[PDB]
Amino acid sequence: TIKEMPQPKTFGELKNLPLLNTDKPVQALMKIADELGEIFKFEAPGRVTRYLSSQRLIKEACDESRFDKNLSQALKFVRDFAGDGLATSWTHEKNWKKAHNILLPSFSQQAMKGYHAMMVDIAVQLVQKWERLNADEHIEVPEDMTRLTLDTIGLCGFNYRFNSFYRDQPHPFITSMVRALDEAMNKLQRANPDDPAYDENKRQFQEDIKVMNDLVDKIIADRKASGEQSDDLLAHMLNGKDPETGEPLDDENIRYQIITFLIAGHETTSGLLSFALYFLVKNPHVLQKAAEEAARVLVDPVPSYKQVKQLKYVGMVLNEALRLWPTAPAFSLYAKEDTVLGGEYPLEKGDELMVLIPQLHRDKTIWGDDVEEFRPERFENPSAIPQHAFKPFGNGQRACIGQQFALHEATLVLGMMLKHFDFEDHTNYELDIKETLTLKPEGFVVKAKSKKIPL
């Protein structure tokens, strides 16, 4: 029979809404889940969702015959500049399935072999930056990781160089994309959005949408004009046809895909590299085992695709960082039809669910009692992990299309970092996780002492 769902504290007619009026709402929801357990109701004026934390319930939420992707309010705000690109589209929009089918070959593990050389171009620029630091300078870790991931998406995707390692202030496009994301997220905690206080925000948002559209629309038009034949993401969208409908993407949807790759991939991936290096410096025995593998495998001056696939322990480090702090920490679902969740929670068609990934990844019934320890070896026998226990890239057809790109990039870069430098947590850095659409260890800094191995 039916179980009644717990609910966190309420604020009269505002219901639970003021609980998300905080700088770190994911971390606040994790503490609620510790207090209330695997499922709790969350109400706001005019809306409700149910937050899920256990593998037992999230295995069912991941059944695509019963639940489909919902656009969170954050994604609906991002949609104002990401349009109907893949991340901010409903599964029922025609341009979702058309873009999914056209793009999927461009994102496969096999496709990584053609992106590898340009990933090494940007990775070598990061290593050279660090080798050229003076004694006792330091590294700002998320900032350098983000320079790397943005430049790698831009080059590998569309043959465009942001030249982030040549700058203090980013390329105008980046400045506009970052200020537009930041406005979209700030709209989630704005009590009176038509107050004159926000006139300048409005004006600045429209200006940044035009900067992004103008740049990306020109890159697409320049490529079509030159007839330059390439195999990059832009090439495949200009050339590719959906096998189902037989149609290509139009130029406006190509622009939205390019903007989408930039915003979906830049901070997720740079957060994964930042959290990985954080956990290595805080666990020197794990750092040592990952550095030994990098030295044994990366025997040439430039890593090859085949070498990066042999950095097995580096891969487990990266999975263990995604376990503890998955950098896109939540995703939303709706019930396609009335159904019962977990034998005891009846749901009506349209009812929303939220998957709280960091909490899923702390389920002691899956991982055992040491869930807060950073132990990459927990990924040595991955066939033993039950279904839907480990969800940093989302679920099903609406899972991350960039997963192979992100992990090849992060394994290559973290392997080169461990081959080339010893690392010092010179400030005994205290973890402070800043939340935007993604998670970052804010202010994480290290010193890197060169092992003096040439490139």
Annotated binding residues for heme, as ranges? 400
Contact between 86 and ligand C=Cc1ccccc1 per CB under 6 A? no
Cα gap 380→366, rounded to integer Å = 15
Sign of CA dihedral 152, 154, 155, 158: positive
- Which residues 406-435 are close enough to bind ligand HEM by CB under 6 A? 406
Q: CA-CA-CA-CA torsion for 70, 75, 76, 78, nearest 10 degrees?
A: -160
Instruction: Give the DSSP H or E segment for 356.
Output: strand 352-356
Given 254, 322, 437, 439, the residue binding ligand C=Cc1ccccc1 (CB under 6 A): 437
Contact between 82 and ligand C=Cc1ccccc1 per CB under 6 A? yes
Q: Which amino acid is at 140?
A: E
For residue 398, the partner it binds in ligand C=Cc1ccccc1, ligand HEM, none, with Cβ less than 5 to 8 A by kind, is: ligand HEM
CB 379 within 8 A of CB 319: yes
Minimum CB–partner distance for residue 67 and ligand HEM (Å): 11
CB 60 within 8 A of CB 355: no
For residue 142, the partner it binds in ligand C=Cc1ccccc1, ligand HEM, none, with Cβ less than 5 to 8 A by kind, is: none
Each residue 208-247 as x (binds ligand HEM by CB under 6 A) or -, in order, gives ----------------------------------------
Q: Which of 451, 356, 371 minimizes the C-alpha distance to 39?
A: 356
Each residue 291-330 as x (binds ligand HEM by CB under 6 A) or -, in order, gives -----------------------------------xxx--
Cα 418 to its chain centre, rounded Å, is: 23
For residue 263, the partner it binds in ligand C=Cc1ccccc1, ligand HEM, none, with Cβ less than 5 to 8 A by kind, is: ligand C=Cc1ccccc1
Given 33, 62, 78, 314, the residue binding ligand C=Cc1ccccc1 (CB under 6 A): 78
Residues catalogued as catalytic: 268, 393, 400
- Reported as half-sphere exposure (CB side, CA atoms, 13 A), residue 41 has a value of 16
For 231-249, give one letter per residue: b (16+ CB within 10 A) or e: ebbbbbbbebebeeeeebb
Residues annotated as binding site? 51, 400
- Please state, in angstroms and as integers, the Cα–Cα distance from residue 14 to each residue in 7, 47, 243, following that order: 14, 11, 49
Nearer to ligand C=Cc1ccccc1, 264 or 291 (CB): 264
Minimum CB–partner distance for residue 187 and ligand C=Cc1ccccc1 (Å): 15
CB 317 within 8 A of CB 276: yes
Nearer to ligand HEM, 186 or 404 (CB): 404
Given 58, 62, 212, 263, the residue binding ligand C=Cc1ccccc1 (CB under 6 A): 263
Q: Which of 232, 338, 229, 327 minimizes the C-alpha distance to 276?
A: 327
Contact between 272 and ligand C=Cc1ccccc1 per CB under 6 A? no
Given 174, 318, 328, 446, the residue binding ligand C=Cc1ccccc1 (CB under 6 A): 328
Cα gap 406→381, rounded to integer Å = 22
Cα gap 220→158, rounded to integer Å = 9
For residue 78, the partner it binds in ligand HEM, ligand C=Cc1ccccc1, none, with Cβ less than 5 to 8 A by kind, is: ligand C=Cc1ccccc1
- DSSP string covering 13-74: GGTTGGGG-SS-HHHHHHHHHHHH-SEEEEEETTEEEEEE--HHHHHHHT-TTTEEE---HH
Cα gap 378→279, rounded to integer Å = 15
For residue 58, the partner it binds in ligand HEM, ligand C=Cc1ccccc1, none, with Cβ less than 5 to 8 A by kind, is: none
Given 95, 269, 283, 319, the residue binding ligand HEM (CB under 6 A): 269
What residues have CB less than 8 Å from 84, skipping those under 6 apart? 93, 95, 96, 253, 256
Minimum CB–partner distance for residue 296 and ligand C=Cc1ccccc1 (Å): 34
- Which residues 377-406 are close enough to bind ligand HEM by CB under 6 A? 392-394, 398, 400-402, 405-406
Chain residues binding ligand HEM by CB under 6 A are 69, 86-87, 100, 153, 260-261, 264-265, 268-269, 272, 326-328, 331, 392-394, 398, 400-402, 405-406
